[PDB]
Amino acid sequence: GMAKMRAVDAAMYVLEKEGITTAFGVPGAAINPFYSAMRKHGGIRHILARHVEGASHMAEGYTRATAGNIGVCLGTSGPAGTDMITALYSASADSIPILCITGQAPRARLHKEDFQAVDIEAIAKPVSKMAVTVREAALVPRVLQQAFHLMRSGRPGPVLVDLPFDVQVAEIEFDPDMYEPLPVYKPAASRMQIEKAVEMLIQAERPVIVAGGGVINADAAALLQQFAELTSVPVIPTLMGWGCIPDDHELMAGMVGLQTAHRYGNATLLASDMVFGIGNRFANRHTGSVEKYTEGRKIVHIDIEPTQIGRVLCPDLGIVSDAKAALTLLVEVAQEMQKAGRLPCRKEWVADCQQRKRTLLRKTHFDNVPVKPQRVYEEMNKAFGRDVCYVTTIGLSQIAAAQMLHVFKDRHWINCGQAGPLGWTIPAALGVCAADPKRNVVAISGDFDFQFLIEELAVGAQFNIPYIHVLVNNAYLGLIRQSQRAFDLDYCVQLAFENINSSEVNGYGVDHVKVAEGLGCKAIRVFKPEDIAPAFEQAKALMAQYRVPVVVEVILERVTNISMGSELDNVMEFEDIADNAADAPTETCFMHYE
Amino acid sequence: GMAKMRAVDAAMYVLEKEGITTAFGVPGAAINPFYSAMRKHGGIRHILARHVEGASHMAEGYTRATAGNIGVCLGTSGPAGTDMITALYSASADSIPILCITGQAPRARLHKEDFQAVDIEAIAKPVSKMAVTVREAALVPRVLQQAFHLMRSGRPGPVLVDLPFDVQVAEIEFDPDMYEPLPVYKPAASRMQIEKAVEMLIQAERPVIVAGGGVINADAAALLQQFAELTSVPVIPTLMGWGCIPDDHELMAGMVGLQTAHRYGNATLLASDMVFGIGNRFANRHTGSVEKYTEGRKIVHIDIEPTQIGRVLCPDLGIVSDAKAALTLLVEVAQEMQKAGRLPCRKEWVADCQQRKRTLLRKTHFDNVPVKPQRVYEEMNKAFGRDVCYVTTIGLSQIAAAQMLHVFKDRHWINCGQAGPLGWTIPAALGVCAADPKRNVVAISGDFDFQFLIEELAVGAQFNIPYIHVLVNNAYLGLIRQSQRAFDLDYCVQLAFENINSSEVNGYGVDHVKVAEGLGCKAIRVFKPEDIAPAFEQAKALMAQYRVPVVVEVILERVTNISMGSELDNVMEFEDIADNAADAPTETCFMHYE
Amino acid sequence: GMAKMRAVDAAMYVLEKEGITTAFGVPGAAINPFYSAMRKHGGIRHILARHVEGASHMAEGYTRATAGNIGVCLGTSGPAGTDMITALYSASADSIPILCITGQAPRARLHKEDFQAVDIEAIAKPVSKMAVTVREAALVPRVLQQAFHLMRSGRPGPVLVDLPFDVQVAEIEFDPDMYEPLPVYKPAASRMQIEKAV
Numbered sequence A, B: 001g002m003a004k005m006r007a008v009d010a011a012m013y014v015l016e017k018e019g020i021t022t023a024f025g026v027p028g029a030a031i032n033p034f035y036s037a038m039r040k041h042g043g044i045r046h047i048l049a050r051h052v053e054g055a056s057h058m059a060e061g062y063t064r065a066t067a068g069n070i071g072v073c074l075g076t077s078g079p080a081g082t083d084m085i086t087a088l089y090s091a092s093a094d095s096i097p098i099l100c101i102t103g104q105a106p107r108a109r110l111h112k113e114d115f116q117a118v119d120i121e122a123i124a125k126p127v128s129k130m131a132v133t134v135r136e137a138a139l140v141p142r143v144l145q146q147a148f149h150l151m152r153s154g155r156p157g158p159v160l161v162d163l164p165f166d167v168q169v170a171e172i173e174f175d176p177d178m179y180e181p182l183p184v185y186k187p188a189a190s191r192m193q194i195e196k197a198v199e200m201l202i203q204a205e206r207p208v209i210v211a212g213g214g215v216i217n218a219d220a221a222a223l224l225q226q227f228a229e230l231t232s233v234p235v236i237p238t239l240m241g242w243g244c245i246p247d248d249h250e251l252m253a254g255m256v257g258l259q260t261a262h263r264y265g266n267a268t269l270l271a272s273d274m275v276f277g278i279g280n281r282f283a284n285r286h287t288g289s290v291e292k293y294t295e296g297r298k299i300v301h302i303d304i305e306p307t308q309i310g311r312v313l314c315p316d317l318g319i320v321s322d323a324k325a326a327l328t329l330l331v332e333v334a335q336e337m338q339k340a341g342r343l344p345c346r347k348e349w350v351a352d353c354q355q356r357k358r359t360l361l362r363k364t365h366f367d368n369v370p371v372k373p374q375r376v377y378e379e380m381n382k383a384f385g386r387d388v389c390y391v392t393t394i395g396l397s398q399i400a401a402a403q404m405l406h407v408f409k410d411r412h413w414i415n416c417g418q419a420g421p422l423g424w425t426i427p428a429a430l431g432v433c434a435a436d437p438k439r440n441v442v443a444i445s446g447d448f449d450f451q452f453l454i455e456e457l458a459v460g461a462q463f464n465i466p467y468i469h470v471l472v473n474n475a476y477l478g479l480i481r482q483s484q485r486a487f488d489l490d491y492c493v494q495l496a497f498e499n500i501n502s503s504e505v506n507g508y509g510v511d512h513v514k515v516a517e518g519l520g521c522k523a524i525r526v527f528k529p530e531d532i533a534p535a536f537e538q539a540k541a542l543m544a545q546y547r548v549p550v551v552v553e554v555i556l557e558r559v560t561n562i563s564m565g566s567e568l569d570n571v572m573e574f575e576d577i578a579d580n581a582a583d584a585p586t587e588t589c590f591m592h593y594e
Numbered sequence C: 001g002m003a004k005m006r007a008v009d010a011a012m013y014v015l016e017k018e019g020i021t022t023a024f025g026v027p028g029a030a031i032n033p034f035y036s037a038m039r040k041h042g043g044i045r046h047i048l049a050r051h052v053e054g055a056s057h058m059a060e061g062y063t064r065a066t067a068g069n070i071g072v073c074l075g076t077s078g079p080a081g082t083d084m085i086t087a088l089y090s091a092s093a094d095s096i097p098i099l100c101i102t103g104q105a106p107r108a109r110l111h112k113e114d115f116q117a118v119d120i121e122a123i124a125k126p127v128s129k130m131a132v133t134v135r136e137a138a139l140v141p142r143v144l145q146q147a148f149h150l151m152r153s154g155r156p157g158p159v160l161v162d163l164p165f166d167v168q169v170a171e172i173e174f175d176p177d178m179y180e181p182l183p184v185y186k187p188a189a190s191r192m193q194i195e196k197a198v
Ligand SMILES: Cc1cc2nc3c(=O)[nH]c(=O)nc-3n(C[C@H](O)[C@H](O)[C@H](O)COP(=O)(O)OP(=O)(O)OC[C@H]3O[C@@H](n4cnc5c(N)ncnc54)[C@H](O)[C@@H]3O)c2cc1C
Pocket: A093, A094, A095, A154, A155, A156, A211, A212, A213, A214, A215, A217, A218, A237, A238, A239, A240, A241, A256, A257, A258, A259, A260, A261, A279, A280, A281, A282, A283, A285, A286, A302, A303, A304, A305, A308, A321, A322, A323, A324, A393, A394, A395, A399, A416, A417, A418, A420, B115
């Protein structure tokens, strides 16, 4: 029961009671007392990163992998905290928590210029739900207790806790048996709200549901699918909702937007007369101009956060609610409407949507040498099972991947959709694997994203954390080259050079096979499209055998312009489109996934 | 003359007028208009980094290399700006400027949640002299004009300028012929202040001058040496002042502090009766407890910043002045005192200081296998000339290097002394080489620092930027292991693993020779101490021949405890001390440098 | 000559050398050592206001009346400082200075919800050229020295100096004879610019 212990020893009991079992970090002198309490306590597996930014993105992958997870990132004072800002931003931006814990100079020296003392509280305030320097040892458990309440309540977001060295080692009296987590705050829609939304849905003749990341945040994917099935309403997931209904479900109508979107998804949205938004916001790369997106359409918006409703467009009906509470009530009311015979039949509209999904395609089956990126994603759909979990960040690599890969379960598309920090992909994939060693994790990176935090591969080697990383190498910042077309420029975006140790890379610059092997991983380079599928089969074998990351590097043609535009009705198709299965053989309409 | 142009085109003329010739950056869509103006203008050499943090630390190395330089760092919106915070902190902390320029979402969408729009102004405020989002196109030249005034005036520091996309492309009328840089503000000591300081100096019987980074910031090293020679007063440089008098000068008395310090330097400070501080602050790792540092000693402090005087200890005389203005007047007054016969002879005190410098040594000449790190620094002193320019960050690698290497000119020790961010070393060295292609740049890293931003070696390969990187590999976070001794811990600080591709690294983990070669550089691994000197000779040849970075990796014994303590009178000597040249052959007392 | 004195006594020598002769204020327990120093030093005429906002606007009128004047407004901790925000905004907005000086709780109690302790630094930062809590007794003369430089230089504006009670009464060594005001920064047009204008 009650005993005298250091404030960091009390912190270990609090973290255990709050369900923490994993931490990613880089120790230093100012955070040593915390590491010493973590060693004495046991039960937290620490993973040593090779950049503080790597540890903070591992914590994001850990959070995102499984409902209820909270990745923890640990660092010393000074530059460690400033190295966490990008991850706090990325987590805030996507409404997901991580808990960052930093050491700090002792309280008496905070306004002197103590070595590596920085005002991290002020720096981190705009990208966190709370950033606090703990000023008394007895407050360490209470700040953590409040932090966990904030990370789970309302619109979720990250917390930074900053621990002065003297506060960490100071004694307190603490009773772990008496510690209890605070209740989680979640507003719930009333029946009056939900019945109005269902009445509006029944009146629409061509409705779609836009299912957002809030549905996944609330762990409500099964209810979302059930509500769509009862009402027979096609579902458009946002990039952050992708997976909340399986991609081969007959009501999955494709994705919408300026870049990570399908031709059939955009055409279905523009033909619709109502958008029933659940757990989405209306992101600008999803909508284009809001005036065109809302034209001729009633808009419903359900969001847990009141000030998200009406922020970018005015809904006809806005409801403040947790998505699981809302969907529980939407299923009940839809079942009552079904018994009363008041849900309309929707066979024509569902048939029109499916017809678009069957004909408005993009070619993937390219035999070209050098390889076309879209062929890589066709081979990934064939090589990996239905349970594949993709991790990716940003680039033409990521945009085309979102256009052409398929996913079948929530939290099998792990992607930092609002902030898109380069280098996120490797640490996030390691964090997903740490959350779930049985997960079939496959990452996708372009060469530039792969280089930012390339040293994190050695974390996977040191700790034996296996996953497959697909690296598509054009020796370009490919997305920036494409955006420079508007300026008739191709300027400062090339990565190629004659590698003085590897004439076999043929002027592509970095030799990723050599780099990955020096970092302790396995790697395979692919030049010809028919060698992609065997390489994915070797990579699985190498992974079972050595239990380390395996990189499959595909050498691409230097320049491919991926389809994108500035409005839903203006997406330009640069590469070949398709209307038949032979050019696009891995659409779910044509291919059984597992 | 006057013409209509985009606001970014006016920015190019302003940057040219302000002396900018180099920029380090990573383009993205939101900053493309600026890149397009930089391409159209010419005359700025852009260097593409492989992490935005790498570009920001290259800008720091560029600033630090040469008086008057201002490194420029360019990035897109969102995570690029959050990736610059660590460099802004490091530059603020050391009183040096960089100019960071970020793209931003258009003004009308700043409070919507536009893709990658972040409140970078608020995040960067605590680590910059100005952080501003430019709200009108006509203000772009005026914000830059104010930015350059701030970066050069008072206590120097960094500026972040954030450019909304629509502000960048909007037209203005601008006349480059009429643009003029603002005057620089620098307070100057009066004769009444300086005469009082010289009177106090004359009364002291055992004075020392502590020469800080402010002397180098003011470009006043030659005056500092001249003032010490006229008054015959021994000089103790801080780590940030190191080089402002040559290490073989008869008045150079060694360095002082808890870690990067000499036994003779600390013993000389504790024996002194006055500290004449010029351009220093009194950093806690330099002083220890201020009560012990000031005991029995009058303190003079000259600083350009009024609120630095009395911040950590109360001087007997505090003077607000630029160090060059102060030293100009100190030389004149000392010459007047010399003509009047009022400067005391100081032969005994100078002789006592030199006697300490000759006898209070640390052993470097170790024949051990595996290699002892202190032998590496002895070989570096022999292999490189007097004009060597060292670049380093933090770790036992850096602390012992500061204890045992010698430097002979200002700005030949490039080191982020207050913030110490891991990964700084490679990008900073590339930035120094970009500032001065004739500089003989040698970097020092431990293995963990080397890994953080290891991909930046490919920047040196792509752009042919040659320098030598000494990598001392203990497969440990060695400084943290040593600080964990106080907790009877060795926990989460080891980097070793059995590399499945390289049994020759013998369980040390990452194979840096393979990684460096995959990144396009040359590399040499050294296991035996007698092979260090030949490896430095091969590295010079490889560098002349291939014009890329050359890494020399020395395999160290796993555990070496470097001398350090918590007070000047308590520094513990773990490894062998020396009182003879044979154990410490590269002290300047024993060895002629060039 | 150099002498031992309280930080507030050294502040009195600084205000004298910077030309202060008048102050408007409302005393309180947290600013009493400063009032005790003003009484002992003499040479500043104090006008007692009947609202802290009244003292802050008297300081504005005193500044605005005559070139080179700097009105000084004095108050205690807590609501006195919040009583001053409107004048700080009015002074900033018109590019003119006032010097506001507030008492504050002792440093050891600044995060402990001590009676009438408020984060006036953060509240006043948007409406001042500088707003600072002085953390060391030796810094009191230096903060005032930087304040007068900022109030006169560039675009002029007001400054708020917040004084913890333990900082005010701590002894320091200060030599009034050695104090000198900082140079004022004012940029000047070149002849090239003026000929173009004409
Ligand atoms: C290069 C690139 C291209 C992209 N292209 C596209 C594209 O074409 N189309 C596209 O759609 N996206 C695209 N994205 C992603 C896009 O930027 C956004 O991240 C995404 O559209 C946002 O999805 P969302 O509306 O579900 O929002 P989210 O960020 O997932 O959040 C939606 C809402 O959920 C709420 N919420 C949180 N928890 C709960 C809960 N328990 N219950 C209810 N509500 C809750 C939050 O308050 C928030 O308002 C792209 C990203 C990149 C990097």
